[PDB]
Amino acid sequence: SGAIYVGNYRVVNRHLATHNDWANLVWEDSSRDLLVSSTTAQGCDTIARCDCQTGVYYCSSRRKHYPVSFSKPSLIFVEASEYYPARYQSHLMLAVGHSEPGDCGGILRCQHGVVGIVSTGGNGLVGFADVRDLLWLDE
Numbered sequence: 488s489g490a491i492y493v494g495n496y497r498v499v500n501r502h503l504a505t506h507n508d509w510a511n512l513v514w515e516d517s518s519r520d521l522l523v524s525s526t527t528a529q530g531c532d533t534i535a536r537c538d539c540q541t542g543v544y545y546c547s548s549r550r551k552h553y554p555v556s557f558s559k560p561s562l563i564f565v566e567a568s569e570y571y572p573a574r575y576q577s578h579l580m581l582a583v584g585h586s587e588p589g590d591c592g593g594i595l596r597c598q599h600g601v602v603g604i605v606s607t608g609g610n611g612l613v614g615f616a617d618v619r620d621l622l623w624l625d626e
């Protein structure tokens with residue numbers, strides 16, 4: 488679990504969005520596993536606007552932060568799950584690191600701010616949904 492709180496927006500994994508997220512929907516994209524909902528309170532986070540390919544993520548299944556080198560946002564095949572059919576997920580960045588299904592929502596940050604959130608995992612892999620291209624989150 489986990490979310491990004493920026494301005495009057497809450498960014499979550501689409502597959503983990505609550506009834507309240509959907510009732511206050513701003514934007515969602517199944518191909519990116521992202522959903523953004525509106526909030527009444529002002530958020531605690533700031534978004535990176537950069538091309539960093541290294542950063543640190545929070546891994547809830549280890550209660551620890553790990554440094555990672557990750558690929559540029561791209562279209563990657565993701566196997567079927569209870570949440571989605573087998574498909575290509577866009578704007579996804581992969582890295583070598585530990586992840587378990589409940590780790591989704593963990594934040595990846597670089598020196599400039601929030602880069603994205605954990606969205607996939609594999610045998611020694613972790614995938615992050617990028618949010619750096621969503622410029623409207625800042626206004």
Ligand SMILES: COc1cccc(NC(=O)N2CCC[C@H](C(N)=O)C2)c1Cl
Binds near residue numbers: 568571587590609
């Ligand atoms: C060790 O295996 C791991 C580790 C961490 C996460 C995952 N689950 C995914 O990757 N899924 C399921 C949820 C939905 C995701 C999606 N974005 O489609 C895909 C797995 Cl299989």
Ligand SMILES: [Zn+2]
Binds near residue numbers: 535538599
């Ligand atoms: Zn950066």
